[PDB]
Design a protein around this ligand. Sequence first.
Ligand code: E9F
Length: 247
Amino acid sequence: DPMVTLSSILESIINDMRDLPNTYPFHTPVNAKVVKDYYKIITRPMDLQTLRENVRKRLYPSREEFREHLELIVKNSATYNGPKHSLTQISQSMLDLCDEKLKEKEDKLARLEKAINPLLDDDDQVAFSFILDNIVTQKMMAVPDSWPFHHPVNKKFVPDYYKVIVNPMDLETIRKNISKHKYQSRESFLDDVNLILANSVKYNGPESQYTKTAQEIVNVCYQTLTEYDEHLTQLEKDICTAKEAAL
Ligand SMILES: C[C@@H]1COCCN1c1nc(-c2ccnc3[nH]ccc23)cc(C2([S@](C)(=N)=O)CC2)n1
């Protein structure tokens, strides 16, 4: 079972990162009753024990989902302690070691990932994701003053944001989903794109400049999809055929 082999590799990486100096503050969940403001600042807590339990629950079908959770450990420290705090440097040392090990094992990992999810090896899936990513970076992120939508809102800077927006979405998260080949057609991609606009309508109001910008992001997305419609339609058909064949 390739998911088991993959999981054993990921756990070994966790063992190696746990062994780096001064990493103990990251080995187990923050005690939110001692660090009493922690959840007022941090939205996505993560630690090496939770990461290991997620590996054991087989939640990670590839390098990328594992690494995204690992990176939260660094981002949370950067937000809570500060970008240059020793705790943030320590957590960065674990992400760096992870990246070394992932590089050393990349061919074995690619093979496991493809055995777990054959679409990661499908040339039509790959081409489709490449086009979506270029639409995001060259068209949607190029909309003037689109910076509020480039990354997740940091609750440190907008403290009530996630009390209002319980289904957040942003363009970086979409790019990560594209890199994971989450989208097999333009409809699921557009579900996420439109969630960005819906969240701005809900949080900022229909007439806010934030919402006008988000509306422009969605509109140039539709315009660019229309320009590539016939290629995208062929790719979506061939992906559906590949998806059905993996059965
Ligand atoms: C103007 C506020 C205050 O100044 C500090 C940052 N800033 C801000 N706002 C949003 C945002 C997005 C959508 N709708 C919103 N409504 C109100 C704010 C808001 C996003 C972001 C970032 S970030 C720094 N990762 O948090 C880039 C994602 N920063």
